[PDB]
């Protein structure tokens, strides 16, 4: 099954990074969708350094490794501040409120982010998303560094 990244991000809600296997990730990481076209998605990527919010306008272009691919499950990003050049959504819940994104950066760092619509709460995360992220972090070859970039002090 393929999971469309333009449907998962087609919301006016903030998409927060709940969990990530990136080592030493930024704080209060989130995306805000600005526009979705047939060629890609314009959004605003933010994080918090020492109380201040840094934001950048990004355009993720839908890319396909063949001509038979039409599901928009992968985006290429240019001029990303952390060197992230590609993102691939490999799982998302049916209500599109949580997803697992494999992130490829230019420094050859590859990690996984568990993203959620709206700010993370202490309730019950979708069981499918949870078991999928558990399976991934269990499948990491040595030293799984899973942290949460979100805090209740993030606005």
- Among 110, 148, 138, 137, smallest CA distance to 24 is for 148
Q: Name the residue with tokens 């202490």.
A: 122
With 0-12 / 13-18 / 19 or more C-beta atoms within 10 angstroms meaning exposed / middle / buried, residue 44 is middle
Residue spans of the domains in the chain: they are: 5-138
Q: From CA 7, how far away is CA 68, in angstroms rounded?
A: 19
CATH superfamily name and code, 5-138: Calycin beta-barrel core domain (2.40.128.20)
- Work out the end-to-end distance of the chain between its first and last CA atoms, rounded to an integer number of angstroms: 34
Give me the resolution in angstroms, 1 decimal.
2.1
Ranges of beta strands (E only) in the chain are 15-20, 27-36, 40-49, 52-62, 74-77, 84-92, 98-105, 110-117
- CA 37 from centre of chain: 19
Method by which the coordinates were obtained:
X-ray
């Amino acid at each position: 099954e393929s999971f469309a990244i333009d449907e998962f991000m087609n919301t006016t809600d903030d998409i927060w990074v709940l969990n990530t296997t990136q080592q030493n990730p930024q704080a209060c990481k989130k995306d805000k969708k600005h526009n979705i076209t047939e060629n890609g998605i314009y959004f605003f990527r933010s994080h918090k350094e020492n109380g201040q919010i840094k934001t950048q306008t990004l355009f993720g272009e839908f890319i396909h490794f063949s001509e038979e691919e039409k599901v928009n499950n992968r985006i290429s990003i240019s001029d990303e501040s952390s060197g992230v050049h590609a993102e691939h959504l490999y799982y998302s819940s049916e209500d599109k409120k949580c997803g697992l994104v494999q992130v490829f950066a230019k420094d050859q760092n590859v990690w996984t982010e568990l993203r959620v619509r709206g700010h993370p709460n202490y309730g019950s995360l979708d069981a499918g998303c949870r078991r999928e992220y558990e399976a991934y972090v269990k499948e990491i070859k040595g030293k799984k560094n899973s942290t949460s970039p979100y805090s209740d002090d993030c606005q």
